[PDB]
Amino acid sequence: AMGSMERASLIQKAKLAEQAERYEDMAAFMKGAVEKGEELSCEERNLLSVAYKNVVGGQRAAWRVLSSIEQKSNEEGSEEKGPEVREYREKVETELQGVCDTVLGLLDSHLIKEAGDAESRVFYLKMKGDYYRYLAEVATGDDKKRIIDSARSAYQEAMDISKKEMPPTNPIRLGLALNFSVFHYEIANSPEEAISLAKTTFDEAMADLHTLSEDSYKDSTLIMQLLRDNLTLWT
């Protein structure tokens, strides 16, 4: 994609699109940058992730609105409205699945296999877990279980690497644990695993804060607060 545009120009325009809150453009620019075939820097990985998280975030919010309207229409005493609500929910659902498939395709061809450093490999595997989790949110057929296991497997490999190779306060390690705990609670029907993971992650980060500079302390404590916010909701 965007084959005639320079890699550096794609990156520059992705940053401009973020400033303009044009996240579909931002995602298309970063997709083009990935397809240039070179590995991504730390900043470039963040741009890719921010772009697609915004795009699929809007799709997920729309899908939830429509799914809620659809569920109310199928209750007792509800007046038959026709196929329109289901049809439009299906349209949004198919578009969302297409975006998730696109991101998973970028990770599989060939971001993950070329990611040798812990920071890059864990980042991409966390992404892989996230986008399978988004597929799992809308899955209802013969592959919901397989999609869930694909998310779990990606998150688990990222966790294993992050525990071996990163300090407990590393923001990617913390965000990975946060999202894996959300996976356990919301997708895998394992709230106790979710709570245990969030607690252990928070406590081990707390004990490592003394090693950090003022700026790194700010980065880590921000994500620790998100873990605490979930624990407050779950307990």
Partner: peptide, 9 residues
């Protein structure tokens, strides 16, 4: 339950 917002670089 909140995941990483992750929508601002």
């Amino acid at each position: 339950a909140g995941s990483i917002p992750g929508r601002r670089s």
